[PDB]
Amino acid sequence: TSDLIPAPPLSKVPLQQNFQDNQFQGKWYVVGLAGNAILREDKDPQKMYATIYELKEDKSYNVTSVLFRKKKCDYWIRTFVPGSQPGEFTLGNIKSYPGLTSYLVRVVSTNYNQHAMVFFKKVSQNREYFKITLYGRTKELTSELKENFIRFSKSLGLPENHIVFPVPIDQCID
Numbered sequence: 327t328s329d330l331i332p333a334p335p336l337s338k339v340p341l342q343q344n345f346q347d348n349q350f351q352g353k354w355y356v357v358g359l360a361g362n363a364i365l366r367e368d369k370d371p372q373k374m375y376a377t378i379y380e381l382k383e384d385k386s387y388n389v390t391s392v393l394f395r396k397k398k399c400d401y402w403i404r405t406f407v408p409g410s411q412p413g414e415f416t417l418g419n420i421k422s423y424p425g426l427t428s429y430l431v432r433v434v435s436t437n438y439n440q441h442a443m444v445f446f447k448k449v450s451q452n453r454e455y456f457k458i459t460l461y462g463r464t465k466e467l468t469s470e471l472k473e474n475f476i477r478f479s480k481s482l483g484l485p486e487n488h489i490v491f492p493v494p495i496d497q498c499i500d
């Protein structure tokens with residue numbers, strides 16, 4: 327058994343106008359994180375991790391994340407394939423992920439060189455998850471960007487305790 331805040335309908339999730347795929351490349355730090363399966367846990371606060379986007383020849387992205395867990399660096403790789411409009415993607419090689427029947431990415435807003443907000447929705451074991459990531463090119467962002475992110479997450483039905491600001495670290499992500 328499992329209870330989840332429902333995914334918003336896509337009409338409520340804006341799309342970055344005139345998305346520039348090659349400017350979105352490079353390292354982004356995960357400055358904010360929110361979702362129906364994200365919980366604020368004060369006993370054990372989430373550590374910052376990073377995500378690198380690289381354009382392949384075919385204009386899919388190789389997307390690599392690194393996190394510091396159990397005293398080591400863990401890498402995971404995914405392929406984002408361009409969707410129906412610029413700034414939208416689906417997950418490549420979906421059959422290689424057991425349980426996963428759907429996966430969508432939509433870039434909500436970015437200025438490419440400081441901040442981005444990205445929306446993810448997926449269906450895993452027939453359950454529907456969503457998250458919003460607040461990316462920064464650096465590890466800190468203005469109170470304004472963070473409050474903007476809180477507001478947007480709440481507009482999608484997420485209460486405060488489903489919204490976390492991972493703690494900046496030095497291991498693995500520099």
Ligand SMILES: NC(=O)Nc1ccccc1
Pocket residue numbers: 346349437438439
């Ligand atoms: N900063 C930056 O790269 N901006 C940009 C580039 C091309 C088109 C639209 C916006």
Ligand SMILES: NC(=O)Nc1ccccc1
Pocket residue numbers: 361363364446447448455456457
């Ligand atoms: N917790 C969590 O990771 N949720 C999630 C992940 C990927 C896509 C959509 C939602």
Ligand SMILES: [Cl-]
Pocket residue numbers: 356377391459
């Ligand atoms: Cl990410």
